[model samples]
Target chain A: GSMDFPQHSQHVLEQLNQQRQLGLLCDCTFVVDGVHFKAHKAVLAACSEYFKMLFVDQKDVVHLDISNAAGLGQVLEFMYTAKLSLSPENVDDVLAVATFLQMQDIITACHALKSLA
Target chain B: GSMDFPQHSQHVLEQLNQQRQLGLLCDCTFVVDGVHFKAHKAVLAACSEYFKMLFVDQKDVVHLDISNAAGLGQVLEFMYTAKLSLSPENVDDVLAVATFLQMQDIITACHALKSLA
Candidate 1:
């Protein structure tokens, strides 16, 4: 039975959000400008082409050379929560990082938001 | 802006399905009757109450005392894919493991399928 339980993925993502909050099951630590973000490689790779390439060979802490750390946080949060926090102040910052990460969802969302503005 | 992009989680889970196939970012190994299953603890704990407790203190391999290994793979696949493969022959077996893993989606799906069966 190729039965689709729609709530199943939603619930799984919900649980991972809680786990991310508590810092449980975090297997990868990403560093940008020496600031560290702990996350699951499975998750980062799940949504990020950047991470998919980075995790081709696993590492405990991988350094990223992106300039927009503010945008980076928003993108990472979006990855875990499926919700993006956008503001006039941060949308461009997020858009840049989202583009670099090849997160098409955020890229499209940001561009769409920009067009409305 | 707490903007919801519904496709984000679905895309994330889809990537994880491929990663599960590639055996990437798998942080946990579950053993039942000495048979090992490689998986991401984040995904497992995201869905299984049993695994949330099991991963509170992370380990490389944890042994599960489940008697139905045949049911185990189906449940695991469902976890990564959000799709359950069921049939008359394996429905009850899958249900047994799903209940053991506390996967309410599959438990409910199995029960619903049975009602129609």
Candidate 2:
């Protein structure tokens, strides 16, 4: 019979988030508006088709759009950490950025927040 | 307001598992019993301190001990997929390998199965 260890997935993510914080094992780099963000392509691509399509090459250093720069890192943070910080002021930025990036969950979360507010 | 997107984590892990299946974005290599396993350091180090201690450098090709070669790939499979396919016969081998790898959750899983049996 097949069994799932739910803790396996959760612990691995927690560990990966800590690794992101430590700045180790990061293989992908993105620059938006003079802000440098280092992350894992596997993590980014796993979260969104946007990154997966852009990361056909494993050695890629992706350059995000300057217009979305303000909200890009927040999306990346959501990708790595699973936490999307959306305030009334920043919800529009996140929604636009997430729409461009094809992050459906983040987009949905943004709308949900807006609805509740 | 900050909100948690549960789908974000679930999607990322499922997508990463698919990436592993397609053999893309794999940054680490291990050969166990002539079985070549391609995986990610971020995923491995995130799951176990055993790999975290060994992976100080981003670009490293590790040689695992041949003694544990038989059970190594299965452990890697669990790390990537969160599904540990274990039977009574193979559980012992996985237990030893998980113990060696310091995969506490997998070890606990092994014990749980053993207890039920």
Against the native complex, each candidate's DockQ, computed on alpha carbons, is 0.69, 0.65
Q: Per-residue lDDT tens digits of candidate 2, residues A1-117?
A: 678766566677777788878898898786666667888888888877777877885356355454345577687677766766778888888888788778888888888889974
Off by over 4 Å in 1: A31-35, A57-64, A67-70, B31-35, B57-64
A66-109 in candidate 1: lDDT tens per residue? Answer: 74466776777778776777777788988887887888888888
Query: lDDT of each model, Cα atoms only?
Result: 0.79, 0.76
Instruction: Give fnat for candidates 1, 2 and onward, in order.
Output: 0.82, 0.78
Candidate 1 residue pairs that clash: A1-B86
Q: Across residues B5-87, which tens digit of lDDT does each residue of candidate 1 receive?
A: 44667788888888877777777786655678778878888888877877676364456667346677778778878888888
Q: What's the TM-score of every candidate structure? A: 0.84, 0.86
What number of clashing residue pairs does each candidate have, in the order they appear? 1, 0
Which candidate number would show the highest lDDT if scored against the true structure?
Answer: 1
